[PDB]
Amino acid sequence: KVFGRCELAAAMKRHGLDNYRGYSLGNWVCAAKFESNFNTQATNRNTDGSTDYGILQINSRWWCNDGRTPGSRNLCNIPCSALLSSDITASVNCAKKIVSDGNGMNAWVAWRNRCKGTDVQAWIRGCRL
Ligand code: NA
């Protein structure tokens, strides 16, 4: 599914991401925009052979099992295909584990490079939340 901005904002808010570990909702929406373009089905392969899955482009080396990433931890205890669902529950629950991991949202390279230190409130402006 390709989310609309406000639609995703509302879903992320419902799943407890607004202010999760101190990151306002706008951060999460920004990160989803530049990671996946709001498309739950986005995949992208890395040079290391791992792949990133879903709206938040969660990586198969650490976080999910895709059956093809040797010596990967599956710290979210999920098949990586669960991350591509139109229901973002799994992506959100895994993202909460990642963000808790000690590097915060810097784990998301597009967040660091395109959202961090910008006016991220702009990503939820106009939305009914
Ligand atoms: Na893995």
Swiss-Prot record:
Catalytic-site annotation from UniProt: 35, 52
Family matches, as SUPFAM superfamilies: Lysozyme-like
Tissue specificity: In the egg white and polymorphonuclear leukocytes.
Residues the record lists as binding substrate: 101
Compartments reported by the entry: Secreted
Enzyme class: hydrolase
Ranges where the C-type lysozyme domain occurs: 1-129
GO molecular function, one term: identical protein binding
Similarity remark: Belongs to the glycosyl hydrolase 22 family.
Role noted for this protein: Lysozymes have primarily a bacteriolytic function; those in tissues and body fluids are associated with the monocyte-macrophage system and enhance the activity of immunoagents. Has bacteriolytic activity against M.luteus.
Protein's name according to its UniProt entry: Lysozyme C
Species for this entry: Gallus gallus (Chicken)
